[PDB]
Amino acid sequence: DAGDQLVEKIKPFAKRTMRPEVLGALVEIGKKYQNPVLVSGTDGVGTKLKLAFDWDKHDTVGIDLVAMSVNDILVQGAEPLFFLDYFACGKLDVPRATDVIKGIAQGCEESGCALIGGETAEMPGMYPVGEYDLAGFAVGVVEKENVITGLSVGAGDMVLGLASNGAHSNGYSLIRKIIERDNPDLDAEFDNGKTLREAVIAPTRLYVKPILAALEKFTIKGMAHITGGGITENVPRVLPKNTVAQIDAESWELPKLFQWLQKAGNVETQEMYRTFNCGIGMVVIVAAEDADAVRSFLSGQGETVYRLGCIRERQGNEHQTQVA
């Protein structure tokens, strides 16, 4: 069987993601946790899969898949533990599927979680030749007293920003409409020694290792993963009803990729802040007394940290995240 051929080829990829907790697929919880709470989430890649088909580039969308879930569970303080993926298609292409799952496993390695199982469904006729669908599922563990809830966020807290690797996994319907409209030279140098194509399909950044190392030394009051809805619709999810996150627009330069998308797309700036991450992949809220020490740590871990702004008292039905 094709799927049986695929199962053997991916055994090496998954074997490198294993953890001592991995014993259906059985996972033990480390005695590290006294009162363990499980944090889980599911997601797909979105319309970025369309560029992966069109460009025949399948070895990175698996990193996008994993990041979408492990980064989501990360905001509660959870350490990612294990991951499962579901892969659906019409007729199985073992070399191309192997590439897809190889990237998944690679993203699991970077997140410190084990890829312990999955499912490859062949539905002949439901998918066009060459196309497929991906779903991922992540589970992490956090101590009950260490759950990051955002309830202590109050006026005076400083808003930090972790830089993103590009558009990540959101806003690609617009990126695709633009590219089909301009037919731009996708293989020309675009930024930081990467071609425009390389910048567009760049895999989503994982924040797991530096954020977890940070939590060993500091208290993080809240976090927001910047995905669907951009900055302004995602940060208010951890903010108390009475607080506003005020973002100074000049605290970070808009990366070149988003500068191109707004120009070509002719998008009002406030629509950009609610559509693309605009270079901000993860928002970390901390106490002002900790803001400097955390920024140095996260920068020393390899991240690019900005001081986006601070938390203030809300005035009425005021929007809870304003960039200006």
Ligand X SMILES: Nc1ncnc2c1ncn2[C@@H]1O[C@H](COP(=O)(O)OP(=O)(O)NP(=O)(O)O)[C@@H](O)[C@H]1O
- Contacts with ligand X, residue ranges (CB under 6 A): 3, 7, 41, 43, 68, 72, 85, 87, 101, 117-120, 227-228
Longest dimension (CA), the chain: 63
Locate 181 and state its tokens: 């409209």
Task: State the nearest-atom distance from the C-beta of 263 to ligand X, in Å.
Answer: 26
Locate 245 and state its tokens: 């996150």
Q: Is 303 exposed, middle or buried (0-12, 13-18, 19+ CB in 10 A)?
A: buried
Q: Does 41 bind a copy of itself (CB under 8 A)?
A: yes
Task: State the nearest-atom distance from the C-beta of 144 to a copy of itself, in Å.
Answer: 7
Residue sitting closest to ligand X (CB): 118
Q: Does 133 bind a copy of itself (CB under 8 A)?
A: yes
Euclidean distance between CA atoms 70 and 39, whole angstroms: 10
Task: State the nearest-atom distance from the C-beta of 7 to ligand X, in Å.
Answer: 4
Task: State the nearest-atom distance from the C-beta of 287 to a copy of itself, in Å.
Answer: 21
The set of residues, in sequence order, having a beta carbon less than 8 Å from that of 72 and lying 6+ positions away, is 41, 43, 138, 225, 227
The residues binding Mg ion (CB under 5 A) are: 43, 68, 72, 119-120, 227
Q: How many CB atoms lie within 10 A of CB 46?
A: 20
Task: State the nearest-atom distance from the C-beta of 127 to ligand X, in Å.
Answer: 15
Q: Does 118 bind a copy of itself (CB under 8 A)?
A: yes
Q: Does 35 bind a copy of itself (CB under 8 A)?
A: yes
Q: Does 152 bind a copy of itself (CB under 8 A)?
A: no
Euclidean distance between CA atoms 49 and 133, whole angstroms: 8
Euclidean distance between CA atoms 67 and 113, whole angstroms: 11
Q: Does 240 bind a copy of itself (CB under 8 A)?
A: no
Locate 41 and state its tokens: 């989430």
DSSP, residue by residue, 264-280? HHT--HHHHTTTS-TTE
Applying CB under 8 A, the residues found at the interface with a copy of itself are 23-29, 31, 35-44, 46-47, 49-50, 72-73, 75-76, 78, 82, 84-86, 88, 116-119, 121, 123-127, 131, 133, 135, 137, 139-140, 144, 147, 173, 223-225, 237-238
